[PDB]
Amino acid sequence: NEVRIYPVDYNSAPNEKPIKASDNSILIDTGSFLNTAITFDSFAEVPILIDNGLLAQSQQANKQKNAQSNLISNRINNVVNGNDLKSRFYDAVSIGSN
Amino acid sequence: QDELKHLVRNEYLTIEIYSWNGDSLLLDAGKITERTGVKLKTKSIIGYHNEVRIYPVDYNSAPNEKPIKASDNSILIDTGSFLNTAITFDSFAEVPILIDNGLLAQSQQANKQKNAQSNLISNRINNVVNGNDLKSRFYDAVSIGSNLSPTALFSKFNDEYNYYKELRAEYKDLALQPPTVTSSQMGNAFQIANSINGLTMKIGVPAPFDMDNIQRYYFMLGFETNDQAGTPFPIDSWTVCNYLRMRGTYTIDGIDPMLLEQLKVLLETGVRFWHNDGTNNPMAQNVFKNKFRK
Amino acid sequence: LSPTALFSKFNDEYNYYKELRAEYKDLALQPPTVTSSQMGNAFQIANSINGLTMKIGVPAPFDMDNIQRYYFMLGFETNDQAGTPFPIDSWTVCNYLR
């Protein structure tokens, strides 16, 4: 048992055509389509009579999840400075013998 | 068009081959020879242990490469990466078995964490050159001449050099968004539920306005080529704009030395030529119409 | 009595060529994939490639030309301390010295 919930029309450019079978069902929805989607797993579990049965839920909990939180910005490394414009303006006015 | 054949690069255009189990290939758009487009080849084992490995063909493979083969003529080692950068389809499926206390190997595989690269760094990040030196040299060259013109001369200078170094992208993106890496305990089962049990290719393209900006940039600024000791190619090549940036020891016949120095510095800064169109303002034209032959 | 234009005749390939230097050296063309099949070596036996494979990565001809031109024109770096410079007229055409 598993559920995967994904946004629709997300990061999908207009005019995109979603592939479908003869049934007309949308096999591949437009956009990320589970590339960035929530994965609901382990609907539940209850202790079972059989002993020595390792809980697969325990193993899944041992597995570590990783999720991004913030996005970096491109312009961090390179930033332009306006001192050049001030210098050019000063030179332009000064060269005029004003 | 031919002018934009170079536009097929990793950052601008993305092609992503996804196996919904969680594995991804993220083939970079570049290095795909125009001779043969994307052509995936699969090597598989089916039996006691089942596995598929799908790799691009003629990818990062220089021409004249010879692929080793046996007497059967089968290609044992295909040219290029050849599974060094390839998608690994595993766990075709699994169903619960009657035998109890049988640890699911699929569970152990899901516990194992997959790692896939998403973006490429750029070499020139740490070291970046600044054009202030050229401006200082030009100012010194003009001033040492005792020219009665004021410093406002240097004000007429234009500096797109720094702006266009700024516009350069720090990180190139192979895929539009990072690939998710989580393997379901059941395994491939989920894909079978929706009848999508197979590889899926998705193409990411820039928006039309960004594409227009990229086209304008490349048409106006030419293509970078750090050739050493090479004669500049014929200036009158493209119809409209032929950007050129030289830096070397040269002298035009019958030229005043100071004018030669000014021309040298100005070219080092980078000068754009607009071909005449028999109009009042040939400098203003539809750049997109620029074509290869003059 | 010459003006500052004298300094304009100066040439500065020093900064350009420090810029051209590579930040990261690459041992392999692309990063090696690290994933071990559960079966193990089995897969390689399927295609009869059960053994080591050596692959050689070489620069493209134009990049090779650029590298050759660079080294021929700029010599080889050697931070010798308190050493007499070697005979200038060694190579046929170009003998860069700093």
Author numbering:
A (entry chain Y): 344 to 441
B (entry chain Y): 295 to 588
C (entry chain Y): 442 to 539
Provide excerpts from the study.
Staphylococcal picoviruses are a group of strictly lytic, short-tailed bacteriophages with compact genomes that are attractive candidates for therapeutic use. Here, we report the structure of the complete virion of S. epidermidis–infecting phage Andhra, determined using high-resolution cryo–electron microscopy, allowing atomic modeling of 11 capsid and tail proteins. The overall structure of the Andhra virion follows that of other phages in this group, with an isometric head (capsid) around 500 Å in diameter (vertex to vertex), connected to a 400-Å-long, straight tail surrounded by 12 appendages. The head has icosahedral symmetry, with the tail attached to a portal structure located at 1 of the 12 fivefold vertices.
